[PDB]
Amino acid sequence: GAMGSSQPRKKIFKPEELRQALMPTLEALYRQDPESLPFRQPVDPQLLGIPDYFDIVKNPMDLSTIKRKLDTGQYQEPWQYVDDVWLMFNNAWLYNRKTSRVYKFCSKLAEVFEQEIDPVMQSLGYCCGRKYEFSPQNDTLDPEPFVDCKECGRKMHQICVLHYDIIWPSGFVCDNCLKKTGRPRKENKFSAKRLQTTRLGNHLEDRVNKFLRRQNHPEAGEVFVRVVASSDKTVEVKPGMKSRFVDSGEMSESFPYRTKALFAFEEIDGVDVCFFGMHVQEYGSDCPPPNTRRVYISYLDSIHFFRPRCLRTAVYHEILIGYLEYVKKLGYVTGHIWACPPSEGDDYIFHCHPPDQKIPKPKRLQEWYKKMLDKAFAERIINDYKDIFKQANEDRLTSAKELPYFEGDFWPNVLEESIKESGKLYATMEKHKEVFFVIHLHQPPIVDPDPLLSCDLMDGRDAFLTLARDKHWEFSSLRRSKWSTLCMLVELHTQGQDRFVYTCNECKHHVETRWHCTVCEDYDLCINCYNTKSHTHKMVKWGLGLD
Ligand SMILES: [Zn+2]
Ligand SMILES: [Zn+2]
Ligand SMILES: [Zn+2]
Ligand SMILES: [Zn+2]
């Protein structure tokens, strides 16, 4: 029953201060006519004919009761007023049908309150005056989390202030109490910029930023593109196709590929926001037919908060066109896209999309890729592109073993169904002609210069979806996506599986204490090499060995 605490520099509010600040908002509700009228007195179920009411609404609340408390002085902190206005709204929204008068009255009162209470609560030193709950995820909704300033005691929305103890382990200090300090907040070192770079990531981001510079739009921020996971996998031929082609030795039992997960982030309001993500499968020059030198885009997802909107599509295209150009240069021959719009509520990569992010009609989605590919053809990056059906006929395919066979793809499961219902494949291909693109990119072996990044969280799409569902990292709004990115990036920086050995770029020996180049992407010399091999750039001394 007993809980002790200390809080000397606490913000404490005197009644009159609140009223002078708060009640101009409670009055803006009373001024709503006729909408405020059912809310000026406690709901009387015996006047209205609804004995129902007190069984459904457990804590009645209304304007008059709130006006009393604001005059009684019963509100010590400003959140208690705000909690009571939202309690009023939540009662009405609950009991009444979304079509009734009162429910629509309520949404008008609430829209007014949102506009009034935000600037006021911010003048009192808070983030906003909203009540937030996370999307459904029964009956219950989970409440957003709060942080208290270790100085003020002012309760804040953790998502509003974007505070996380891992980044700032000495705790949350509100922006004003930091002004009573001179020193600003410490830098967030768990940023997108600071994710390990790759030639693949760099080529894509170098291409997006070069485009954004020519655009010179003032709302735009820097784009960071990062490969965050890669590994070597195999796809096993399924049992039907196995007995039909593997036992004879016409198809290999499994096909090797390298999978990669990559994300793009944009600077928006000075923080990292993840707006684009993609998993790919890459079948090299030692992969047997039919997968030799082929890349396939398994899953592609996006969140529409990129700034500005009028550049969103062009930047998605720049990443995709950049991916084709990159693997074309390394030696891949064909690319494949499965252009399928999500089945409402299926999140491809990011948990919980914005309610008003458009799910495109399949004709629009395919036109979208067509425009991207047409753009690539124009720049002479693509040699040509056709749908799977027109392409199969043009190559005179007659056997199922000539269809590329990719992990998790549509066609391996169509082939299993065909074999199981045998006792028309060209018909199924024409039927879904529009959904499957075949991209012609064009030799010595393919050698990927990037190393593998072990990151279980991004080894395929399920691990990150699950973690975001459990942690309520939604991408449903700009403010929630900012928070989700923040924590996503903390997970990549600190919970990955790679540990780093350092070698001298000259004699290749393992180093502890070392000279690290300030200019080159990643260049080191042991003490001995620093003492013999000249390097023209300034170098700094890093590490500290125990011998
Ligand atoms: Zn807030
Ligand atoms: Zn504070
Ligand atoms: Zn050396
Ligand atoms: Zn250098």
Helices 78-95 and 15-30: crossing angle in degrees, nearest 10, is 30
H/E stretch holding 187 reads: none
Whichever domain contains 94, its CATH number is 1.20.920.10
Which ligand is nearest the CA of 538, by number?
4
Q: Which two tokens stand for residue 411?
A: 């066609």
Q: How many angstroms does the Cα of residue 512 sit away from the middle of ligand 4?
A: 19
Q: Is 427 helix (H, G, I), strand (E, B) or coil?
A: helix
Torsion angle of C-alpha atoms 413, 419, 420, 421, degrees rounded to 10:
110
Question: 257-296: string of b/e by CB count within 10 Å (b at 16+)?
Answer: bbbbbbbbbbbbeebbbbbbbbbbbbbbeebeebbbbbbb
- CA 238 vs CA 287, 409, 420: distances in Å: 17, 12, 12
**Three-class SS of 346-411:** CCCCCCCCCCCCCCCCHHHHHHHHHHHHHHHHHCCCCCEEEEHHHHHHHCCCCCHHHCCCCCCCHH
What's the one-letter identity of residue 495? Answer: Q
Q: Which two structure tokens, joined as six digits, stand for 432?
A: 């879904």
Rg of the chain over all Cα atoms, to the nearest angstrom = 30
8 CA from centroid of ligand 2 (Å): 12
A 10 A CB-CB count for 47 gives 8
Query: What's the full length of the chain, in residues?
Result: 547
User: What is the helix, strand, coil percentage profile of the chain, to 5?
Assistant: 40, 15, 45
CA of 120 to the centre of ligand 2 (A): 16
> How many angstroms separate the alpha carbon of residue 546 from the centre of ligand 3?
18
Distance 127 CA to ligand 1 centre (A): 4
Rounded to 10 deg, the angle between the 15-30 and 63-72 helix axes is 160
The residue with tokens 């990643």 is 522
Instruction: Please name the residues in contact with 403: beta carbons below 8 A apart, sequence gap of 6 or more.
Output: 290, 392, 397, 411, 415
β-bridge mates for residue 356, sequence order: none
Question: How far lies 16's CA from each of 19, 75, 78, 116, in Å?
Answer: 5, 11, 12, 19
518 with 539: CB under 8 angstroms? Answer: yes
Task: Write out the H or E segment, with its range, that includes residue 315.
Answer: helix 312-330
Q: Distance between CA 209 and CA 266 in Å, rounded?
A: 10
Ligand nearest to C-alpha 519: 4
User: d(Cα 157, Cα 144) in Å, to the nearest integer?
Assistant: 7
**Cα(65) to centroid of ligand 1, in Å?**
25
Q: Are 223 and 266 in contact (CB under 8 A)?
A: yes
Residue 476 CB coordination number (10 Å): 19
Nearest ligand, measured from the Cα of 535: 4
d(CA 236, CA 253): 6
Which of 158, 150, 148, 163 lies closest to 7, judged by CA?
Answer: 150
| Cα–Cα distance measured from residue 535 to residue 514, given in angstroms and rounded to the nearest whole number | 14
Q: Which residues pair with 232 in a beta bridge?
A: 258
Residue 220 CA to ligand 2 center (angstroms) comes to 31
CA dihedral 389, 322, 326, 379 (to 10 degrees): 70
Alpha carbon 23 to its chain centroid, in Å, reads 39
Q: Which residues contact 503 (CB under 8 A, 6 or more apart)?
A: 509, 510, 511, 524
The Cα 250–Cα 267 span in angstroms is 51
- Structural domain of residue 29, as residue ranges? 15-124
Please give the distance, rounded to the nearest whole angstrom, from the Cα atom of residue 159 to the centre of ligand 1.
7
Ligand 3 centroid to Cα of residue 511, in Å, is 8
- The DSSP symbol for 246 reads I
Half-sphere exposure of residue 136, counting CA atoms within 13 Å on the CB side?
A: 5
The candidate with the shortest Cα–Cα distance to 255, out of 242, 243, 269, 237, is: 237
Q: How far apart are CA 522 and CA 518, in angstroms?
A: 9
End-to-end CA distance of the chain: 56
Of 186, 260, 187, the C-alpha closest to 225 is 260
Q: What is the resolution of this structure in A?
A: 2.4
Tell me the technique behind this structure. Answer: X-ray
* d(CA 149, ligand 2 centre) in Å: 5
Residue type at position 307 = R
CA of 172 to the centre of ligand 2 (A): 8
Q: What gap in Å lies between CA 306 and CA 317, rounded to an integer?
A: 13
Q: Return the residue matching tokens 């304007």.
A: 63
| Closest residue by Cα to residue 224 from 183, 181, 193 | 193
List, in order, residues 6 or more apart from 144 with CB less than 8 Å away. 132, 133, 134, 157, 158, 159
Ligand 3 centroid–CA 525 distance in Å is 5
Cα 356 to ligand 1 centroid, rounded to whole Å: 22
DSSP 143: B
Q: Which SS3 state, helix, strand or coil, does residue 467 take?
A: helix
- Sorted by sequence, the CB contacts under 8 Å of residue 135 that are 6+ apart come out as 141, 352, 474, 476
- 188-217: buried (b, 16+ CB within 10 Å) or exposed (e) per residue? bebbbeebbbbebbbbbbebbbebbeeeee
Contacts of 476 (CB under 8 A, 6+ apart): 135, 352, 353, 354, 355
539 alpha carbon – ligand 4 mean position (Å): 8
Gap from CA of 463 to ligand 2 centroid (Å)? 37
Token pair 């953790």 in the structure block, residue: 158
